Amino acid sequence: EMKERLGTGGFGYVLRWIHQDTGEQVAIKQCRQELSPKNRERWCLEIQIMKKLNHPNVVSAREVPDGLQKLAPNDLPLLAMEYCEGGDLRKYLNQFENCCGLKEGPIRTLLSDISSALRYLHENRIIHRDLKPENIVLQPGPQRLIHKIIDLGYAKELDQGELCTEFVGTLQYLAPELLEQKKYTVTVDYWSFGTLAFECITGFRPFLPNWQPVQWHGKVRIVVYDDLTGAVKFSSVLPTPNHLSGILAGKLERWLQCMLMWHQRTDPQNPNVGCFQALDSILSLKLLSVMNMVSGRVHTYPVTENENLQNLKSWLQQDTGIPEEEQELLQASGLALNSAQPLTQYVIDCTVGDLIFLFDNRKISLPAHPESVSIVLQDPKRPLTYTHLRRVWGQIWQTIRALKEDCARLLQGQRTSMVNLLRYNTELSKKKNSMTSEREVQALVDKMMALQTDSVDLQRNPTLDDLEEQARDLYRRLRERPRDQRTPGDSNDMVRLLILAIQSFEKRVILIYDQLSKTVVCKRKALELSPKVKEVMNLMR
Ligand SMILES: O=C(c1ccc(Nc2nccc(-c3ccc(Cl)cc3)n2)cc1)N1CCN(CCO)CC1
278 secondary structure, DSSP code? I
Integer CA distances (angstroms), 380 to 228, 400, 499, in order: 20, 17, 11
Instruction: Confirm or reject: Cβ of 91 under 6 Å from ligand 1.
Output: yes
Residue 477 Cα to ligand 1 midpoint, Å, equals: 27
For residue 529, give every residue at least 6 positions away whose Cβ sits within 8 Å of its Cβ, in sequence order, or none.
Answer: 447, 451
- Give which of 115, 103, 106, 34 is closest to 75, Cα–Cα: 34
Name the closest-CA residue to atom 29, ligand 1: 6
Residue 84 Cα to ligand 1 midpoint, Å, equals: 8
Q: What are the residue ranges of helices labelled H in 381-535? A: 392-414, 419-427, 453-456, 465-474, 493-502, 510-516, 531-534
Instruction: Confirm or reject: Cβ of 87 under 6 Å from ligand 1.
Output: yes
Instruction: Confirm or reject: Cβ of 83 under 6 Å from ligand 1.
Output: yes
- Please state, in angstroms and rounded to a whole number, the distance separating the CA atoms of residues 483 and 463: 34
Same domain, 266 and 318: no
Q: After which residues is the chain broken (C to N over 2.5 A)?
A: 221, 265, 352, 363, 438, 462
Whether 327 and 316 have beta carbons less than 8 Å apart is answered as yes
CATH of residue 446's domain is: 1.20.1270.250
Name the closest-CA residue to atom 28, ligand 1: 6
Residue 390 Cα to ligand 1 midpoint, Å, equals: 26
C-alpha 248: how far from chain center: 10
508 secondary structure, DSSP code? T
Residue 157 Cα to ligand 1 midpoint, Å, equals: 25
Number of H helices and E strands in the chain, helices first, is 15, 12
The SS3 of residue 252 is: helix
277 secondary structure, DSSP code? I
- Please state, in angstroms and rounded to a whole number, the distance separating the CA atoms of residues 149 and 151: 7
Instruction: Confirm or reject: Cβ of 77 under 6 Å from ligand 1.
Output: no
Residue 88 Cα to ligand 1 midpoint, Å, equals: 6
C-alpha 70: how far from chain center: 44
Instruction: Confirm or reject: Cβ of 29 under 6 Å from ligand 1.
Output: yes
- Give which of 368, 342, 357, 365 is closest to 289, Cα–Cα: 357
Question: 61 phi and psi, to 5 degrees?
Answer: -70, 180
Same domain, 424 and 505: yes
The amino acid sitting at 387 is T
Residue 133 Cα to ligand 1 midpoint, Å, equals: 11
For residue 301, the cross-strand partners are: 288
Whether 193 and 259 have beta carbons less than 8 Å apart is answered as yes
Same domain, 25 and 136: yes
For residue 39, give every residue at least 6 positions away whose Cβ sits within 8 Å of its Cβ, in sequence order, or none.
Answer: 11, 164, 165
- Please state, in angstroms and rounded to a whole number, the distance separating the CA atoms of residues 250 and 255: 8
130 is catalytic: yes
Final residue belonging to a domain, choices 284, 311, 333: 284
Name the closest-CA residue to atom 1, ligand 1: 87
Same domain, 452 and 421: yes
C-alpha 418: how far from chain center: 31
Q: Which atom from ligand 1 is nearest to the alpha carbon of 29? A: 17
Final residue belonging to a domain, choices 233, 255, 284: 284
Same domain, 58 and 90: yes
- Please state, in angstroms and rounded to a whole number, the distance separating the CA atoms of residues 195 and 130: 11
Same domain, 2 and 124: yes
Question: How many independent structural domains does the chain possess?
Answer: 3
Same domain, 268 and 294: no
- Please state, in angstroms and rounded to a whole number, the distance separating the CA atoms of residues 30 and 15: 8
Residue 140 Cα to ligand 1 midpoint, Å, equals: 13
Pocket test for ligand 1, best of 146, 150, 151, 152 (most atoms within 8 A of CB): 150
CATH of residue 258's domain is: 1.10.510.10
Same domain, 151 and 84: yes
Pocket test for ligand 1, best of 11, 88, 138 (most atoms within 8 A of CB): 88
Same domain, 196 and 79: yes
- Please state, in angstroms and rounded to a whole number, the distance separating the CA atoms of residues 531 and 372: 51
Resolution in A: 4.0
Q: Where are the beta strands (DSSP E) in 19-127?
A: 25-31, 79-82
For residue 271, the cross-strand partners are: none
- Give which of 423, 416, 399 is closest to 512, Cα–Cα: 416
- Please state, in angstroms and rounded to a whole number, the distance separating the CA atoms of residues 105 and 284: 11
Q: Which atom from ligand 1 is nearest to the alpha carbon of 83? A: 11
Same domain, 304 and 434: no
The amino acid sitting at 173 is Y
Establish whether the linkage from the previous residue to 37 is cis, with ω within 30° of 0. yes
Instruction: Confirm or reject: Cβ of 61 under 6 Å from ligand 1.
Output: no
Instruction: Confirm or reject: Cβ of 137 under 6 Å from ligand 1.
Output: yes
Same domain, 96 and 142: yes
For residue 55, give every residue at least 6 positions away whose Cβ sits within 8 Å of its Cβ, in sequence order, or none.
Answer: 116, 117, 120
- Please state, in angstroms and rounded to a whole number, the distance separating the CA atoms of residues 302 and 324: 20
Instruction: Confirm or reject: Cβ of 150 under 6 Å from ligand 1.
Output: yes
- Give which of 42, 7, 274, 280 is closest to 137, Cα–Cα: 7
- Give which of 282, 257, 261 is closest to 192, Cα–Cα: 261
- Give which of 365, 294, 290 is closest to 330, Cα–Cα: 290
Radius of gyration of the chain (CA): 30
- Please state, in angstroms and rounded to a whole number, the distance separating the CA atoms of residues 255 and 269: 12
- Give which of 151, 156, 154 is closest to 124, Cα–Cα: 156
Same domain, 275 and 211: yes
Q: Which domain holds residue 350?
A: 285-363
Identify how the structure was determined: X-ray
Instruction: Confirm or reject: Cβ of 6 under 6 Å from ligand 1.
Output: yes
Integer CA distances (angstroms), 357 to 295, 322, 343, in order: 10, 12, 15
Instruction: Confirm or reject: Cβ of 7 under 6 Å from ligand 1.
Output: yes
489-524: b or e for each residue (b if 16 or more CB lie within 10 Å)?
Answer: eebeebeebbebbeebbeebbeebbebbbbbbebbe
- Give which of 464, 145, 166, 509 is closest to 363, Cα–Cα: 509
Name the closest-CA residue to atom 23, ligand 1: 87
What DSSP string runs through 139-202?
E--SSS-EEEE---TT-B-SSS--------S---S--HHHHT-----THHHHHHHHHHHHHHHH
